[PDB]
Amino acid sequence: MTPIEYIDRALALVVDRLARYPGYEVLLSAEKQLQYMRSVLLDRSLDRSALHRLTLGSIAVKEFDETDPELSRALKDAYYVGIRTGRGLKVDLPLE
């Protein structure tokens, strides 16, 4: 799995949930923070600074641990892989 696949998983679940709770500011905030992490992964010119301002882990615990554990887990996975630095990720060579 790549970090982006985790982000995209979380995003799909947030979108699914938004179909049920279209107004929910918490989900809308989560969607914004995921999209930002996604853009950071895709574009090096984008400043990585604001990553420290993200609250996805806190949101999962406070809002979804009880209510929606599938979403909670997905948000936590996405937050973690999103703040992991570039330099520690793993690479597979062809033929290996």
Q: Which two tokens stand for residue 21?
A: 């709770």
Among 11-19, 38-46, 51-59, 85-93, which window interacts with Cl ion (CB under 5 A)? 85-93
Give the residue with the Cβ less far from Cl ion, 42 or 91: 91
Least CB distance to Cl ion at residue 23 (A): 25
Q: Is 9 in the site for Cl ion (CB under 5 A)?
A: no
As a residue count, the chain comes to: 96
**49 lies in the site for Cl ion, by CB under 5 A:** no
| Helix ranges, 1-96 (H) | 3-20, 25-42, 56-59, 69-83
34: tokens are 């995921």
Binding residue (CB under 5 A) for Cl ion from 5, 48, 84, 86 = 84
Angle at 19 between CA 17 and CA 20, to 5 degrees: 70
Among 85, 91, 92, 96, binds Cl ion (CB under 5 A): 85
The residues that touch Cl ion, with contacts defined as CB under 5 A, are 73, 84-85
